[PDB]
Design an enzyme around this catalytic site. Structure first.
Site, PDB file in Angstrom:
ATOM      1  N   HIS A  67       0.998   5.312  -2.059  1.00  0.00           N
ATOM      2  CA  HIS A  67       1.414   6.638  -1.577  1.00  0.00           C
ATOM      3  C   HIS A  67       2.611   7.274  -2.288  1.00  0.00           C
ATOM      4  CE1 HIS A  67      -1.145   7.375   1.913  1.00  0.00           C
ATOM      5  NE2 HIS A  67      -1.090   6.085   2.180  1.00  0.00           N
TER       6      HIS A  67
ATOM      7  N   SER B 190      -4.000   0.944  -4.155  1.00  0.00           N
ATOM      8  CA  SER B 190      -3.395  -0.330  -3.760  1.00  0.00           C
ATOM      9  C   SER B 190      -4.412  -1.426  -3.556  1.00  0.00           C
ATOM     10  CB  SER B 190      -2.610  -0.171  -2.433  1.00  0.00           C
ATOM     11  OG  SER B 190      -3.452   0.132  -1.302  1.00  0.00           O
TER      12      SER B 190
ATOM     13  N   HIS C  29       0.843  -1.209   0.000  1.00  0.00           N
ATOM     14  CA  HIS C  29       0.000   0.000   0.000  1.00  0.00           C
ATOM     15  C   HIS C  29       0.886   1.270   0.000  1.00  0.00           C
ATOM     16  CE1 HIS C  29      -2.902   3.047   1.329  1.00  0.00           C
ATOM     17  NE2 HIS C  29      -2.138   3.253   2.389  1.00  0.00           N
TER      18      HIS C  29
ATOM     19  N   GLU D 149      -5.879   9.387   1.126  1.00  0.00           N
ATOM     20  CA  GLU D 149      -6.151   7.939   1.123  1.00  0.00           C
ATOM     21  C   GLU D 149      -7.271   7.508   0.134  1.00  0.00           C
ATOM     22  OE1 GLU D 149      -4.172   5.724   2.713  1.00  0.00           O
ATOM     23  OE2 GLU D 149      -3.061   7.049   4.036  1.00  0.00           O
TER      24      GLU D 149
HETATM   25  C1  LIG Z   1      -4.963   9.092   9.840  1.00  0.00           C
HETATM   26  N1  LIG Z   1      -3.870   8.334  10.489  1.00  0.00           N
HETATM   27  C2  LIG Z   1      -3.625   8.458  11.801  1.00  0.00           C
HETATM   28  O1  LIG Z   1      -4.306   9.225  12.474  1.00  0.00           O
HETATM   29  N2  LIG Z   1      -2.606   7.723  12.402  1.00  0.00           N
HETATM   30  C3  LIG Z   1      -1.862   6.876  11.632  1.00  0.00           C
HETATM   31  O2  LIG Z   1      -0.966   6.242  12.220  1.00  0.00           O
HETATM   32  C4  LIG Z   1      -2.159   6.762  10.312  1.00  0.00           C
HETATM   33  C5  LIG Z   1      -3.154   7.487   9.755  1.00  0.00           C
HETATM   34  N3  LIG Z   1      -3.271   7.214   8.455  1.00  0.00           N
HETATM   35  C6  LIG Z   1      -2.334   6.313   8.200  1.00  0.00           C
HETATM   36  C7  LIG Z   1      -2.096   5.750   6.803  1.00  0.00           C
HETATM   37  C8  LIG Z   1      -3.259   4.856   6.399  1.00  0.00           C
HETATM   38  N4  LIG Z   1      -3.404   4.335   5.177  1.00  0.00           N
HETATM   39  C9  LIG Z   1      -4.542   3.621   5.188  1.00  0.00           C
HETATM   40  C10 LIG Z   1      -5.143   2.910   4.207  1.00  0.00           C
HETATM   41  C11 LIG Z   1      -6.332   2.220   4.483  1.00  0.00           C
HETATM   42  N5  LIG Z   1      -7.061   1.468   3.624  1.00  0.00           N
HETATM   43  C12 LIG Z   1      -6.546   0.718   2.621  1.00  0.00           C
HETATM   44  O3  LIG Z   1      -5.347   0.592   2.324  1.00  0.00           O
HETATM   45  C13 LIG Z   1      -7.604  -0.140   1.890  1.00  0.00           C
HETATM   46  C14 LIG Z   1      -6.847  -1.436   1.550  1.00  0.00           C
HETATM   47  C15 LIG Z   1      -7.476  -2.810   1.857  1.00  0.00           C
HETATM   48  N6  LIG Z   1      -8.912  -2.916   2.142  1.00  0.00           N
HETATM   49  C16 LIG Z   1      -7.125  -3.765   0.714  1.00  0.00           C
HETATM   50  O4  LIG Z   1      -7.634  -4.889   0.803  1.00  0.00           O
HETATM   51  O5  LIG Z   1      -6.315  -3.388  -0.170  1.00  0.00           O
HETATM   52  C17 LIG Z   1      -6.860   2.334   5.769  1.00  0.00           C
HETATM   53  C18 LIG Z   1      -6.198   3.081   6.750  1.00  0.00           C
HETATM   54  C19 LIG Z   1      -5.051   3.700   6.447  1.00  0.00           C
HETATM   55  N7  LIG Z   1      -4.264   4.485   7.198  1.00  0.00           N
HETATM   56  N8  LIG Z   1      -1.643   6.007   9.318  1.00  0.00           N
HETATM   57  C20 LIG Z   1      -0.492   5.072   9.480  1.00  0.00           C
HETATM   58  C21 LIG Z   1      -0.851   3.774   9.927  1.00  0.00           C
HETATM   59  C22 LIG Z   1       0.148   2.809  10.048  1.00  0.00           C
HETATM   60  C23 LIG Z   1      -0.159   1.521  10.488  1.00  0.00           C
HETATM   61  C24 LIG Z   1      -1.476   1.199  10.813  1.00  0.00           C
HETATM   62  C25 LIG Z   1      -2.476   2.160  10.718  1.00  0.00           C
HETATM   63  C26 LIG Z   1      -2.158   3.446  10.280  1.00  0.00           C
HETATM   64 FE   LIG Z   2      -2.300   5.012   3.485  1.00  0.00          FE
END
Ligand SMILES: Cn1c(=O)[nH]c(=O)c2c1nc(Cc1nc3cc(NC(=O)CC[C@@H](N)C(=O)O)ccc3[nH]1)n2Cc1ccccc1
Ligand SMILES: [Fe+3]
Length: 285
Positions: free
Chosen positions: A169, A228, A164, A209
């Protein structure tokens, strides 16, 4: 009073570590995968700003999982992805070793992005607070997972994994307008109220996202979560999906779905326009 926030890029050392598979994880019952995941989490926990990102020898199984997803997504990108994505993807294949049989190293990708837009990568163990995650963007730091999804289902992951990150990204962080847009989300969040941070995170979610854009009259995808995921990438540009214009005051009220397709997608006219709309919005919160 104002909460602590980083004042320079090395200050992310103090929050990048403020982060066990959930019961429904496809590797939940696998001890070997569990061990591999602890290996990856430790790399991130021990990382400090200034370090080269540790290079990983990926397993044959991990590379196959990547290859399987990579092959199918690349069939779809030409007709589905926004033009900025398509422009940058081949530069990464050239300079960072994006191939079906090779998982790129976060360190090479970070060096490529530092050159292009000043963005850099920081390996992250798992989920951070939105305050901490968005604070990285203020310094053009993207907190990035380094592990690979379980090989039992290459087409689904309940969480971000490095497939992903690398396919969803990285190509847009290499784009100057997108990089500016992203950094300003981080900058706005620094020392902001809890309410303001949550609203910024939701706007981030529906652009970085799950964002769509309109180009030459056509709907295209720029959200990493879409780029992704084969099934949602297709769904998002299918006739059925509910689509609305990106408007921060309205978008920030929308729930961010993790386990299902989104209920709605937001269309930005351009990265420049999304950036302007966020500027107007951040004044109000
Ligand atoms: C807003 N925020 C936050 O407040 N703190 C973080 O830490 C954070 C964050 N956003 C991210 C980056 C992120 N990318 C995402 C992507 C998805 N979704 C997908 O990839 C769909 C894919 C799937 N259904 C498939 O089958 O392909 C869901 C949550 C995500 N969070 N992160 C980093 C992160 C790292 C590890 C686990 C969770 C989040
Ligand atoms: Fe992401």
């Amino acid at each position: 009073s104002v909460p602590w926030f980083p004042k320079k890029i090395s200050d992310l050392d103090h929050c990048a570590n403020r982060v066990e598979l959930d019961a429904d994880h496809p590797g939940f019952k696998d001890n070997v995968y569990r061990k591999r995941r602890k290996y990856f989490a430790d790399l991130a926990m021990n990382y400090k700003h200034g370090d080269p990102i540790p290079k990983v020898e990926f397993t044959e199984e991990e590379i196959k999982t990547w290859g399987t997803v990579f092959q199918e997504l690349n069939k779809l990108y030409p007709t589905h992805a926004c033009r900025e994505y398509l422009k940058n993807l081949p530069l990464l294949s050239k300079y960072c070793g994006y191939r079906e049989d090779n998982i790129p190293q976060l360190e090479d990708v970070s060096n490529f992005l530092k050159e292009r837009t000043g963005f850099s990568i920081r390996p992250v163990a798992g989920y951070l607070s939105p305050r901490d995650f968005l604070s990285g963007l203020a310094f053009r730091v993207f907190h990035c997972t380094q592990y690979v999804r379980h090989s039992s289902d290459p087409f689904y992951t309940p969480e971000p994994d490095t497939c992903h990150e690398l396919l969803g990204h990285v190509p847009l962080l290499a784009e100057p307008s997108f990089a500016q847009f992203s950094q300003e989300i981080g900058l706005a969040s620094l020392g902001a109220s809890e309410e303001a941070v949550q609203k910024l995170a939701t706007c981030y979610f529906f652009t970085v996202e799950f964002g769509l854009c309109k180009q030459d009259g056509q709907l295209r995808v720029f959200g990493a979560g879409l780029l992704s995921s084969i099934s949602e990438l297709k769904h998002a540009l299918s006739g059925h999906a509910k689509v609305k214009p990106f408007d921060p005051k309205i978008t920030c009220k929308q729930e961010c779905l993790i386990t299902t397709f989104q209920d709605v997608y937001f269309v930005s006219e351009s990265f420049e326009d999304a950036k302007e709309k966020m500027r107007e919005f951040t004044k109000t919160i």
